[PDB]
Each structure stands twice: as C-alpha cells, then as structure tokens.
C-alpha cells in the first residue's frame, strides 16, 4: 500500500490460488508365454 500518515487505510489484494490435478494413470504390460517353454528353457524366461 505505502500507507499515508492519516488516510483511512484500505485493504490490499490477496493471491488467487490455482489447483492442478494429476490424474495418476497406469501403464501395464501382459506378455504371454507358453508353460512348456518356461519349463524346458535353458534361459530364465521369467526373470527376462
């Protein structure tokens, strides 16, 4: 304001607030693997 000595001090502004929404989506992968391939593979297909 820069108030004067005697000026009937008036009220000043106040910040206006904004709200931002983060919808928090999901990301999914579903690989299909044959059960016999998992059993007779020399490589650990489950950890790969």
């Amino acid at each position: 304001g820069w108030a004067s000595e005697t000026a009937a001090l008036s009220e000043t502004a106040t910040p206006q607030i904004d709200r931002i929404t983060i919808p928090l989506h999901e990301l999914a992968a579903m690989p299909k693997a044959s059960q016999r391939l998992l059993d007779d593979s020399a490589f650990d297909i489950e950890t790969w």
Partner: peptide
C-alpha cells in the same frame, strides 16, 4: 517368448 514350437518366437 512363447510357444517354443515356433523358432522365431
């Protein structure tokens, strides 16, 4: 990685 019958898969 599936169906061990197929070579490329």
């Amino acid at each position: 990685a599936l169906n061990s019958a197929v070579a490329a898969e």
